Design a protein around this ligand. Structure first.
Ligand SMILES: N[C@@H](CCC(=O)O)C(=O)O
Ligand SMILES: N[C@@H](CCC(=O)O)C(=O)O
Ligand code: NA
Ligand code: NA
Lengths: 249, 248
């Protein structure tokens, strides 16, 4: 049977294809992760239906009742067979779903305007004039919430106390905030790279604060777990992942 | 106690130096040894380190398809884990399981500074400067299977001059760079260790591919997910980075 693939809108990984005429079904979507899905489909021989995650979330655990949401929850509940998205492979998620080998490596960094003295997270941490934040309840925010590093704990103290204002619903909103107020956005380096190639007044500040990968998510115990990993390694070795990144970035 | 297979390779695994005799696991040190200890602290297992009997990483004999090295030790359940700079590859993942990568790297070129050589293409288009790789490892396999004209040219050169340009270990290749006119195709992580200690050497060109090192387990291992979880925990805590800083 066809697989149900959950994903999320996020440039340039997954986007609505533009056209004068209305598109339907899988035709509606394009991007790095859609090319990835197409390549995986060819290797493994499955057909699929792409469905945007119903609640529009990546997947985090509620801090009161411990329940999962987002693409992670859709996999736990067997509402999707695969998640193919810029979904960070994390310790807490791997406890509830399985990730393939990573198809992209990245890390947290800072998006901000050019031509300022700010050169690092420490530079942000030690002031309050320039506000900073991250996507609410994503892997980036979780990094700061969990960190025992003085600088990062101080940044978490700042962000959490200003959660209503500095934590945003999406990368888009974070970028929109950088462009409209004195605001620096903590976000994933791969996505920063796409943003900065299209906004020449924006730049990455400093280097990578951590390291992680994006991987394809499957429900724990899926008969596809190892098949997907093997296919990802095939695409990696074929140089296809590199071509895909060059195409979309 | 879990049996852990590994392989000598600076600075991942090496014999510890001491004025006094050493015994058991205490004979070994290195990044992978520290990693193994960290995995044990998280997962709570005890273990015995054993160097891979045949001293090989793991490849398939092209004649009979037989595996060797640490890969074979896992397939045959002669070890419970492999903790080493073992590349996560397509052919290996079909017969054993790898964790999430604890390190990311790529093939590159180890050679001298100040030369006319600035890329793999520069090596491929000549024959005065010899070049090669570790026999039967992931790097050699990259070249063997490549459809890129530059890399297939390099494979033709290496496979014909096997006895002369392919080496048995990274240490042998590095000494070859240091003592003859030779460029060594090898993994960028290990190159960085070498260039920090040999100021006349440098990496040439960028990474030619991308891959990770992972902990290997036999398929069906009850430890597979717990190992990946622990690796991800060490990643997030910054502990893998600290270990890399320690050994490099
Ligand atoms: N890619 C992230 C969301 C964005 C972010 O946290 O920076 C995740 O998987 O949670
Ligand atoms: N680490 C490699 C061996 C060295 C190399 O091929 O450059 C492997 O896993 O096969
Ligand atoms: Na899992
Ligand atoms: Na496998």
């Amino acid at each position: 049977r066809s697989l149900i693939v959950t994903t999320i809108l996020e440039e340039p990984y997954v986007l609505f294809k533009k056209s004068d005429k209305p598109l339907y079904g899988n035709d509606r979507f394009e991007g790095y992760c859609i090319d990835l899905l197409r390549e995986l489909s060819t290797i493994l021989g499955f057909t699929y239906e792409i469905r945007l995650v119903e609640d529009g979330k990546y997947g985090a655990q509620d801090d009161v009742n411990g329940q999962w949401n987002g693409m992670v929850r859709e996999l736990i509940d067997h509402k999707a067979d695969l998640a193919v998205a810029p979904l960070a492979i994390t310790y807490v998620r791997e406890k509830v779903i399985d990730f393939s080998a990573p198809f992209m490596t990245l890390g947290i960094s800072i998006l901000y305007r050019k031509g300022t003295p700010i050169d690092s997270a420490d530079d942000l941490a030690k002031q309050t004039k320039i506000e900073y934040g991250a996507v609410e309840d994503g892997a980036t925010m979780t990094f700061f919430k969990k960190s025992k590093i003085s600088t990062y704990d101080k940044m978490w103290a700042f962000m959490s106390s200003r959660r209503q204002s500095v934590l945003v619903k999406s990368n888009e909103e974070g970028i929109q905030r950088v462009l409209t107020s004195d605001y620096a956005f903590l976000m994933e380096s791969t996505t920063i790279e796409f943003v900065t190639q299209r906004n020449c007044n924006l730049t990455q500040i400093g280097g990578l604060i951590d390291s992680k990968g994006y991987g394809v998510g499957t429900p724990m115990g899926s008969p596809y777990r190892d098949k997907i990993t093997i296919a990802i390694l095939q695409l990696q070795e074929e140089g296809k992942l590199h071509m895909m990144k060059e195409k979309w970035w």
